[PDB]
Amino acid sequence: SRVYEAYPEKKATLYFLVLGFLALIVGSLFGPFQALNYGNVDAYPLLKRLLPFVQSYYQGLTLHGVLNAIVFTQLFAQAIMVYLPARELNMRPNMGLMWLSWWMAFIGLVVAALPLLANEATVLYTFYPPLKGHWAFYLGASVFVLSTWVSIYIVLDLWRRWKAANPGKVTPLVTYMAVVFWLMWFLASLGLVLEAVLFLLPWSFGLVEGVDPLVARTLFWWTVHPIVYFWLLPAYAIIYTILPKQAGGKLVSDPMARLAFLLFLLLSTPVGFHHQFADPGIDPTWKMIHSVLTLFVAVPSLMTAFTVAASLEFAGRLRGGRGLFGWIRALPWDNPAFVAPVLGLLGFIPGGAGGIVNASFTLDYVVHNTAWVPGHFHLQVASLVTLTAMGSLYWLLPNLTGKPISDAQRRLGLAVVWLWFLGMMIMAVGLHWAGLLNVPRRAYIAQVPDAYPHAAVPMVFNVLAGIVLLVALLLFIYGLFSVLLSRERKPELAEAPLPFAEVIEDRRLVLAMDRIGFWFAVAAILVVLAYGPTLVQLFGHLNPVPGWRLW
Amino acid sequence: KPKGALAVILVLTLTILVFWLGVYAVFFARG
Amino acid sequence: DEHKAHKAILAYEKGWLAFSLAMLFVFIALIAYTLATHTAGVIPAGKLERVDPTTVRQEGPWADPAQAVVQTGPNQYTVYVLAFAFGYQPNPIEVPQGAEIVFKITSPDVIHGFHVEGTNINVEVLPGEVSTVRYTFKRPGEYRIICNQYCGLGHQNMFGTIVVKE
Ligand code: HAS
Ligand code: HEM
Ligand SMILES: CCCCCCCC/C=C/CCCCCCCC(=O)OC[C@H](O)CO
Ligand SMILES: CCCCCCCC/C=C\CCCCCCCC(=O)OC[C@H](O)CO
Ligand SMILES: CCCCCCCC/C=C\CCCCCCCC(=O)OC[C@H](O)CO
Ligand SMILES: CCCCCCCC/C=C\CCCCCCCC(=O)OC[C@H](O)CO
Ligand SMILES: CCCCCCCC/C=C\CCCCCCCC(=O)OC[C@H](O)CO
Ligand SMILES: CCCCCCCC/C=C\CCCCCCCC(=O)OC[C@H](O)CO
Ligand SMILES: CCCCCCCC/C=C\CCCCCCCC(=O)OC[C@H](O)CO
Ligand SMILES: CCCCCCCC/C=C\CCCCCCCC(=O)OC[C@H](O)CO
Ligand code: CUA
Ligand SMILES: [Cu+2]
């Protein structure tokens, strides 16, 4: 194929995409089981006959989160947030680096997967000390994530190269998102890299006897809030700069898109305590600060809601829709690439709503570590992000492989997308409600079937969700494999342009927002100011404690 | 006027508000 | 028309950005309120209070569970709780209703949840550190403690009891 000779980025992107879905499928296999568990139905015996290496509920839970929320989400981000900026500027990504990063990812994953599958790392995707996993888990995880540092460099390169060719022109939209995105991720990632290097790796290696739980946790959450925005923004980039076209309309504001993204660079990292509201040894004043700063990080998505909604109504009116609801039925509901993100956006309403509760200091005490939290995050990542990623099969895959999407396959796509959406709404109800009834998260509750009698109603939703999603999953596997392993190739698809939207004015803001070095340091100050004082007191009073293996 | 978008942000508002006022009520009941 | 729809969208978006900001501020105000009331008692003490997990069952306040309840004021008791794989000591925790209860909770092994069903008590317990929270039980009877932090294979069955005397 001469298409790859000239556009080799298509192949590397494809690789990132395929590995990502492979991880999604394998990770998700465990979900229905878990769903049935939260419905007080124990189907683990069956799962263990099918996959004999699985020793417990918790090993499946470790696989599910790592594979789904770390691996797939990261691979997606890497695919989107390199390929898209590259196509907009019409430039070649540094291919040497592009393959290095893929191999880093692949190898790290391979390495983490070994102790994971062998039952040697059944911590969770949070691997809190002193629960102590196999060194291979920490190493392979570490290497996997560091892959993104190469991605950061790659996009930074493209960006500067373009800027050299074009001094005193503002950054093109998609590329601006990608640049603020990857820089945000660089700040964000220093928490975990720090944790892994100073603590986790030495510890798993036999180098230090103990780790300090609270410092470990504090560093961990430095990263693992912004990581969610890292998951979210590849989806948004699509929702902003592609979806408007797929809908039949335009993006209603370039500046608004830039500003949302700007706010994410500034506000995505200095918030982590909102995961530590119930931790000892952190001053309550610093919790209140992080609380307020968290409410602030809701702003860009609040803004997003309006910008995007308006973009939808706009396309809806352009297609004939009249009334207050007319524009809705006017939109291309026969297109899976249109439907998946929009359905994901609907769920984001209750999703963000629950987030906002979570953020409010004392209110967190109601919901912390109950089923509510999974309820919240399935709506955010397992629905919005995953569904956006799903719908791109129907535009991105043909773009990358030149392989066509039959009408049959378009139909099955609508089904998968819808069943997946509903199943997630259904489970979202069961989880939030069960959460409100004090049902703990991360628990093989079906194995204590008398513990939670009050939860009987939400439980039925969890079962229903379980089966509905098993179906969606099954259909998703069969659909992806029909479209990857299909017969035909029409390279004219692989050569088509991506469906970027046009924009339908405030140059002065735009110029300001383009002073990227400046905003980057503002971000970095905000992190020092938000985390410095606490981390300083913490490092000065370390109390390492021995590791445990309790599985 | 973007009446459709306004509907949406209205739904989003009421959702937040039912969620937030709800759990606030619950916090005080459990306080 | 396209010119006009852009004007209107931007105008209204601005309205909504002010309103959503307002709403966000009002929550901040309502959160602060909670911080000024007795309900704030469940917020951990921010103080670092380091202990040794390996000897905490041998010496110190967690070593004799039957003496874990100590009157620290005219209407105040401190309770020294150990959350461990997989349960709580003492069991049951016995306290009087309407007295202010300072819980000082620690673990000798791994992290555990301390979530008192029916209350706002919900605190992570970390080995090496003492988690200190305050609550005043209004109603007598039996309240169950749930561990809601994954702590290993015994996690799903890790429960404790508090009994509030009339
Ligand atoms: C991609 C993944 C996720 C996103 C995004 C995310 C959003 C937020 N989160 Fe979160 N969450 C928390 C706060 C929030 C807040 C304030 C936001 C906000 O950024 C959300 C703002 C968004 C909105 C305000 C919604 C706007 C709505 C939109 C954009 C849709 C409009 C629809 C349209 C336009 C469609 C209309 C079209 C038609 C056709 C009608 C807190 C604490 O403050 C915790 C800890 C809780 C605890 O006790 O552990 C937490 C923990 C989690 C965890 C679990 C961590 C763990 O395992 O321990 C994960 C995985 C997660 C993921 C995600 N989270 N969250
Ligand atoms: C077939 C769909 C899936 C089902 C039915 C499902 C259901 C579940 C259930 C019931 C839980 C709670 C388990 C517990 O607290 O014990 C869970 C947790 C989780 N899910 Fe999923 N899920 C699926 C897909 C996804 C996807 C696509 C993602 C990521 C994109 C995801 C990420 C997570 C994470 C972060 C965990 C938390 C693990 C932990 O607490 O350590 N879910 N899922
Ligand atoms: C096409 C994809 C969507 C499919 C959606 C199908 C919904 C689930 C079945 C409904 C029929 C009613 C079945 C109920 C009868 C059996 C219930 C039962 O026996 O209860 C379980 C038992 O308590 C535990 O072991
Ligand atoms: C317990 C909760 C479970 C219940 C879950 C329900 C959640 C919301 C479902 C659908 C809303 C979607 C509204 C928009 C639907 C658009 C389809 C449409 O209008 O179709 C046009 C027609 O086909 C000509 O093209
Ligand atoms: C775009 C999709 C739309 C998203 C919008 C969906 C948000 C749903 C909001 C509230 C549901 C909760 C029901 C209302 C609260 C009932 C409270 C109740 O039943 O009280 C508890 C009582 O103590 C126990 O017996
Ligand atoms: C066309 C396909 C549409 C079908 C979609 C279903 C409609 C939603 C309602 C019920 C199904 C729920 C099935 C739940 C499975 C059994 C529930 C269960 O496990 O019951 C426990 C009981 O409450 C204590 O003993
Ligand atoms: C689209 C699917 C998304 C799923 C969305 C999940 C539904 C949760 C909704 C609202 C929670 C509001 C809190 C409800 C609590 C109300 C109880 C109440 O009224 O509180 C006073 C009482 O005294 C206390 O015990
Ligand atoms: C207790 C609180 C009750 C909450 C109940 C829901 C309130 C509705 C929410 C948001 C509307 C935001 C839209 C802002 C409209 C502002 C007006 C505007 O932007 O007007 C410009 C136009 O040019 C003029 O001629
Ligand atoms: C445009 C008009 C401008 C006006 C807009 C102002 C917004 C007002 C909203 C909330 C105020 C907060 C009131 C604080 C009262 C909370 C007390 C409470 O709820 O107390 C429960 C409990 O029983 C005690 O311990
Ligand atoms: C669609 C979404 C629907 C969501 C449905 C919402 C249901 C939540 C209800 C109540 C939570 C409030 C708990 C109130 C605390 C009182 C419990 C209590 O007093 O029980 C233990 C005590 O020990 C005995 O002596
Ligand atoms: Cu102790 Cu879970
Ligand atoms: Cu967070």
PDB file of N, CA, C and O in Angstrom, chain C residues 29-53:
ATOM      1  N   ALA C  29     -20.578  28.331  49.276  1.00  0.00           N
ATOM      2  CA  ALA C  29     -21.107  28.985  50.458  1.00  0.00           C
ATOM      3  C   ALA C  29     -21.728  27.961  51.395  1.00  0.00           C
ATOM      4  O   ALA C  29     -21.475  27.994  52.629  1.00  0.00           O
ATOM      5  N   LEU C  30     -22.522  27.057  50.821  1.00  0.00           N
ATOM      6  CA  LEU C  30     -23.180  26.003  51.597  1.00  0.00           C
ATOM      7  C   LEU C  30     -22.207  24.948  52.193  1.00  0.00           C
ATOM      8  O   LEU C  30     -22.533  24.275  53.186  1.00  0.00           O
ATOM      9  N   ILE C  31     -21.021  24.827  51.593  1.00  0.00           N
ATOM     10  CA  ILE C  31     -20.031  23.863  52.055  1.00  0.00           C
ATOM     11  C   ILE C  31     -19.384  24.465  53.256  1.00  0.00           C
ATOM     12  O   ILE C  31     -19.195  23.786  54.273  1.00  0.00           O
ATOM     13  N   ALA C  32     -19.040  25.749  53.141  1.00  0.00           N
ATOM     14  CA  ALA C  32     -18.437  26.518  54.251  1.00  0.00           C
ATOM     15  C   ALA C  32     -19.346  26.423  55.459  1.00  0.00           C
ATOM     16  O   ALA C  32     -18.879  26.120  56.551  1.00  0.00           O
ATOM     17  N   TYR C  33     -20.643  26.667  55.258  1.00  0.00           N
ATOM     18  CA  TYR C  33     -21.616  26.528  56.339  1.00  0.00           C
ATOM     19  C   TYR C  33     -21.383  25.228  57.102  1.00  0.00           C
ATOM     20  O   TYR C  33     -21.193  25.257  58.320  1.00  0.00           O
ATOM     21  N   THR C  34     -21.396  24.099  56.387  1.00  0.00           N
ATOM     22  CA  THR C  34     -21.233  22.787  57.016  1.00  0.00           C
ATOM     23  C   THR C  34     -19.969  22.763  57.882  1.00  0.00           C
ATOM     24  O   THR C  34     -20.013  22.269  59.007  1.00  0.00           O
ATOM     25  N   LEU C  35     -18.868  23.308  57.364  1.00  0.00           N
ATOM     26  CA  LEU C  35     -17.608  23.465  58.141  1.00  0.00           C
ATOM     27  C   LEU C  35     -17.729  24.185  59.481  1.00  0.00           C
ATOM     28  O   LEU C  35     -16.908  23.972  60.361  1.00  0.00           O
ATOM     29  N   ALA C  36     -18.736  25.042  59.620  1.00  0.00           N
ATOM     30  CA  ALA C  36     -18.964  25.795  60.882  1.00  0.00           C
ATOM     31  C   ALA C  36     -19.882  25.082  61.925  1.00  0.00           C
ATOM     32  O   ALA C  36     -20.071  25.567  63.052  1.00  0.00           O
ATOM     33  N   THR C  37     -20.440  23.937  61.536  1.00  0.00           N
ATOM     34  CA  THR C  37     -21.400  23.239  62.372  1.00  0.00           C
ATOM     35  C   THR C  37     -20.760  21.997  62.936  1.00  0.00           C
ATOM     36  O   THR C  37     -19.667  21.611  62.511  1.00  0.00           O
ATOM     37  N   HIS C  38     -21.445  21.370  63.890  1.00  0.00           N
ATOM     38  CA  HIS C  38     -20.948  20.157  64.558  1.00  0.00           C
ATOM     39  C   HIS C  38     -20.795  19.010  63.578  1.00  0.00           C
ATOM     40  O   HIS C  38     -20.083  18.051  63.866  1.00  0.00           O
ATOM     41  N   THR C  39     -21.471  19.111  62.431  1.00  0.00           N
ATOM     42  CA  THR C  39     -21.439  18.058  61.418  1.00  0.00           C
ATOM     43  C   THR C  39     -20.056  17.925  60.790  1.00  0.00           C
ATOM     44  O   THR C  39     -19.710  16.872  60.269  1.00  0.00           O
ATOM     45  N   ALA C  40     -19.276  19.004  60.853  1.00  0.00           N
ATOM     46  CA  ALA C  40     -17.887  19.008  60.395  1.00  0.00           C
ATOM     47  C   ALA C  40     -16.973  18.054  61.173  1.00  0.00           C
ATOM     48  O   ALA C  40     -15.839  17.781  60.770  1.00  0.00           O
ATOM     49  N   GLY C  41     -17.478  17.548  62.291  1.00  0.00           N
ATOM     50  CA  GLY C  41     -16.689  16.715  63.199  1.00  0.00           C
ATOM     51  C   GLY C  41     -16.115  15.486  62.552  1.00  0.00           C
ATOM     52  O   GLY C  41     -15.104  14.984  63.001  1.00  0.00           O
ATOM     53  N   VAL C  42     -16.760  15.012  61.486  1.00  0.00           N
ATOM     54  CA  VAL C  42     -16.337  13.797  60.810  1.00  0.00           C
ATOM     55  C   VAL C  42     -15.128  14.052  59.940  1.00  0.00           C
ATOM     56  O   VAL C  42     -14.447  13.115  59.542  1.00  0.00           O
ATOM     57  N   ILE C  43     -14.853  15.314  59.634  1.00  0.00           N
ATOM     58  CA  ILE C  43     -13.655  15.624  58.849  1.00  0.00           C
ATOM     59  C   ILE C  43     -12.464  15.172  59.712  1.00  0.00           C
ATOM     60  O   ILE C  43     -12.403  15.512  60.908  1.00  0.00           O
ATOM     61  N   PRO C  44     -11.543  14.388  59.137  1.00  0.00           N
ATOM     62  CA  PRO C  44     -10.320  14.015  59.864  1.00  0.00           C
ATOM     63  C   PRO C  44      -9.623  15.250  60.426  1.00  0.00           C
ATOM     64  O   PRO C  44      -9.710  16.336  59.844  1.00  0.00           O
ATOM     65  N   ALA C  45      -8.978  15.075  61.575  1.00  0.00           N
ATOM     66  CA  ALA C  45      -8.012  16.021  62.075  1.00  0.00           C
ATOM     67  C   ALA C  45      -6.872  15.994  61.075  1.00  0.00           C
ATOM     68  O   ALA C  45      -6.411  14.916  60.647  1.00  0.00           O
ATOM     69  N   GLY C  46      -6.416  17.176  60.689  1.00  0.00           N
ATOM     70  CA  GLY C  46      -5.324  17.292  59.731  1.00  0.00           C
ATOM     71  C   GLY C  46      -3.947  16.974  60.296  1.00  0.00           C
ATOM     72  O   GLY C  46      -2.959  16.973  59.551  1.00  0.00           O
ATOM     73  N   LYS C  47      -3.890  16.708  61.599  1.00  0.00           N
ATOM     74  CA  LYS C  47      -2.635  16.511  62.310  1.00  0.00           C
ATOM     75  C   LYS C  47      -2.020  15.176  61.951  1.00  0.00           C
ATOM     76  O   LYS C  47      -2.726  14.180  61.823  1.00  0.00           O
ATOM     77  N   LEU C  48      -0.704  15.163  61.776  1.00  0.00           N
ATOM     78  CA  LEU C  48       0.018  13.918  61.607  1.00  0.00           C
ATOM     79  C   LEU C  48       0.338  13.360  63.007  1.00  0.00           C
ATOM     80  O   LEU C  48       0.822  14.097  63.910  1.00  0.00           O
ATOM     81  N   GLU C  49       0.071  12.067  63.186  1.00  0.00           N
ATOM     82  CA  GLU C  49       0.185  11.423  64.483  1.00  0.00           C
ATOM     83  C   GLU C  49       0.653  10.073  64.112  1.00  0.00           C
ATOM     84  O   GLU C  49      -0.127   9.210  63.809  1.00  0.00           O
ATOM     85  N   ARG C  50       1.960   9.886  64.104  1.00  0.00           N
ATOM     86  CA  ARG C  50       2.515   8.639  63.602  1.00  0.00           C
ATOM     87  C   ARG C  50       2.692   7.596  64.695  1.00  0.00           C
ATOM     88  O   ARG C  50       3.090   7.922  65.792  1.00  0.00           O
ATOM     89  N   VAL C  51       2.336   6.351  64.382  1.00  0.00           N
ATOM     90  CA  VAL C  51       2.434   5.207  65.318  1.00  0.00           C
ATOM     91  C   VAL C  51       3.148   4.098  64.589  1.00  0.00           C
ATOM     92  O   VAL C  51       3.363   4.183  63.390  1.00  0.00           O
ATOM     93  N   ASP C  52       3.500   3.040  65.307  1.00  0.00           N
ATOM     94  CA  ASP C  52       4.141   1.883  64.675  1.00  0.00           C
ATOM     95  C   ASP C  52       3.151   0.706  64.552  1.00  0.00           C
ATOM     96  O   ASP C  52       2.742   0.113  65.569  1.00  0.00           O
ATOM     97  N   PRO C  53       2.769   0.374  63.314  1.00  0.00           N
ATOM     98  CA  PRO C  53       1.877  -0.726  63.047  1.00  0.00           C
ATOM     99  C   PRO C  53       2.306  -2.075  63.617  1.00  0.00           C
ATOM    100  O   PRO C  53       1.460  -2.926  63.874  1.00  0.00           O
TER     101      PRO C  53
END
